[PDB]
Subunit: 59 residues, 4 copies
């Protein structure tokens, strides 16, 4: 019970950190067209990882 | 039921975003021999992650 | 039994290696504001992955 | 049955591709002390991911 909830909470933290990485790569691309594509893909991965955390919560 | 299907759908989105990252690293390598090796490996990871999403669907 | 314990031990090793990556990116940022943000996010991911390993142990 | 075996096979492919990434980052570091640390950490992650694939096989 509590173990699966701990896993979901940890996965939520991972999604938040991956979104922070996407923003930083955006700023690197500003300082680039290919790097911007990487940052937008990383943002989509963060969104999907947050969806996984919620589904694990439902389990 | 619906939770495991949500996980598979999210993993499919992750594989699509990782394939987008592989293409972008390819274009960086054009702008490199080692970087091209990284892009080809990332493409194989995207292919394997999509296989994982389908197997989770079967579960 | 032993298989789930093996998975947790492997995930612990992954968290240790991700923390090593975060430190190395810190040193790259010293040699940078965006790169430092990436290193701090990677450290948080390592912390969360270690939490996942312990929860899998409890399972 | 077959779904869990498919997941293990896919995870084995991911470990092989991550080892290929580690070698490429090694060659980038040759072309660096921090980059070499990243490559050695990525190699350890590939080793751990292969251990996870085998434990999933045992499951």
């Amino acid at each position: 019970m509590m173990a699966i909830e701990e896993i979901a909470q940890a996965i939520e933290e991972i999604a938040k950190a991956i979104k922070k990485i996407a923003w930083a790569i955006k700023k690197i691309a500003q300082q680039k067209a290919a790097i911007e594509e990487i940052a937008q893909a990383i943002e989509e991965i963060a969104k999907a990882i947050k969806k996984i955390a919620w589904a694990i919560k439902k389990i």
